[PDB]
Write a protein that binds this ligand. Structure first.
Ligand SMILES: Nc1nc2c(ncn2[C@@H]2O[C@H](COP(=O)(O)OP(=O)(O)O)[C@@H](O)[C@H]2O)c(=O)[nH]1
Length: 480
């Protein structure tokens, strides 16, 4: 559409930072649910200022929205500094967007004498701070929006000049499945996260359990036949109860799925102090819903330990090595983790999973994509034992006698020995043998060395080694 191009802007900050306050300060001074403003573009143009009541909401609102977040603005109170939340908000941002702008709000609490040179204190700190972040170059704008406080605008048009500058470069695809994030509610006003629309289309409301029809839609001047991704319009629909859903998920019917467990693609956050231990609970926020699952990790094999990153699929045919801790720091190019939730969460496919750090350093740990969402409540009795997690369990024994040239004796294995008979075994010398208390080994081909070496020579290390493959869920196994 030649007129009215839209881009979403994530407004980030602390619970008392002035985020919600800077919107109105921008919208109001536009050219004279969510707020926004307009302006020409020398490639109209409107930018909805994403916001929310608090944090948790503003997070869950930015994760599943990532694919539509075009740029992140960072609000800061030029007195408190860079408060707690103002830090988490800065990484999640790094995950979703690709650029950001940092503004110093409340630029009225500084005395004129010590302000311009106290401003630079943070401008320096922020700059240096961002040096270790993909938002490494983010410009900074000192600005005071409500110069008095609650009851009682500074350099706002300036903040608009910048906002548009980095607001360049967008791309949107309508081919996906429909997804709209409701922020107003019978009418429904939200933002389109995935897919395309058209009058007469069918829409689902998983919160209410039903599919309604799009009687009409209206955004700014009424015309509307179809919307694309990133747009922000309102879907007029059946006079259902506009109360049960004042902010929720709407999409194509049968488009979402309810998941009891999922195979994410894992990736620790650098700034995460600590390890990533299999079986370590977490606070997972998947798409737009935060459910507490558990983890498990696993990795590829050494042969293709550096295979390309397949970030959209899953090559379920090949096997995978079990890992007790995320290998951080030759290494792997990426790894995964069979999440297992407590509550039947329910959300998109390939949705941007994130979740970490439950406890009584930063609180965020990793982030990943959802490459597969198990839907059966019995993912253990159905899909699970079929998986191929290689659990390399080793053993070692010591060789002693030499019955013949095709026989030896061993004694180890901390046993049963009637359930392992036949497994391919290898002596400390290099020859191969087939395990045929006590022991009974065979050998096709003994070697020349061990043949020379009761017994004789004092057995300078007749060592016996074993290596068998243990798929995590099958009953017992082989190797090769
Ligand atoms: N002193 C002062 N306070 C400001 C100024 N601008 C905004 N605020 C404060 O911003 C607070 C609201 O924060 P807000 O971002 O709406 O919180 P949220 O809506 O929970 O994110 C109000 O209580 C104001 O006191 C300002 O210019 N000077």
């Amino acid at each position: 559409a030649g007129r009215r191009v839209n881009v979403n802007v994530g407004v980030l900050g602390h619970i008392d930072s002035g985020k919600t306050a800077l919107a109105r300060a921008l919208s109001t001074t536009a050219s004279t649910g969510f707020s926004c403003f307009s302006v020409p573009l020398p490639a109209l143009l409107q930018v909805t200022l994403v916001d929310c009541p608090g944090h948790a909401s503003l997070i869950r609102t930015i994760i599943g929205g990532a694919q539509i977040i075009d740029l992140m603005m960072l609000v800061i109170d030029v007195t408190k500094g860079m408060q707690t939340q103002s830090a988490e908000c800065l990484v999640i941002g790094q995950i979703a967007c690709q650029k950001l702008v940092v503004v110093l709000n409340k630029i009225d609490l500084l005395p004129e004498g010590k302000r311009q040179a106290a401003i630079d204190k943070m401008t320096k700190k922020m700059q240096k701070t961002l040096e270790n972040t993909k938002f490494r170059g983010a410009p900074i704008i000192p600005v005071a929006a409500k110069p008095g406080g609650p009851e009682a605008p500074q350099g706002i048009p300036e903040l608009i000049e910048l906002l548009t500058s980095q607001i360049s470069i967008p791309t949107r695809d309508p081919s996906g499945p429909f997804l709209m994030s409701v922020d107003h509610c019978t009418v429904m006003t939200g933002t389109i996260l995935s897919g395309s629309i058209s009058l007469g289309d069918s829409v689902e409301i998983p919160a209410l359990k039903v599919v309604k029809k799009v009687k009409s839609m209206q955004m700014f001047h009424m015309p509307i036949t179809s919307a694309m991704q990133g747009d922000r319009l309102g879907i007029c629909v059946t006079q259902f109860d506009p109360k049960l859903l004042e902010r929720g998920l709407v999409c194509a019917p049968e488009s979402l799925h309810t998941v009891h467990a999922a195979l994410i693609s894992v990736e620790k956050i650098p700034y995460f102090r600590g390890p990533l231990q299999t079986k370590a609970k977490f606070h997972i926020t998947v798409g737009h819903e935060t459910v507490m699952g558990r983890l498990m990790f696993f990795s590829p094999a050494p042969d293709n330990f550096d295979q390309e990153p397949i970030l959209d699929s899953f090559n379920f045919s090949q096997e995978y090595l079990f890992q007790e801790q995320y290998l951080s720091k030759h290494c792997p190019r990426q790894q995964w983790a069979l999440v297992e939730f407590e509550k039947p969460v329910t959300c998109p496919r390939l949705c941007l999973v994130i979740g970490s750090r439950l406890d009584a350093t930063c609180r965020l740990a990793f982030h990943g994509i959802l490459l597969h969402g198990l839907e059966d409540r019995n993912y253990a009795d159905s899909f699970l034992p079929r998986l191929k997690v290689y659990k390399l369990k080793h053993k070692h024994g010591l060789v002693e006698r030499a019955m013949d040239d095709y026989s030896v004796i061993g004694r180890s294995l901390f046993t049963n020995i009637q359930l392992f008979v036949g497994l391919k075994v290898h002596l400390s010398t290099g020859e191969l043998g087939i395990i045929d208390g006590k022991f009974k080994i065979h050998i096709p081909g003994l070697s020349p060395e061990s043949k020379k070496i009761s017994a004789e020579r004092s057995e300078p290390s007749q060592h016996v080694v074993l290596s068998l493959t243990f798929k995590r869920y099958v009953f017992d196994t082989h190797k090769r």
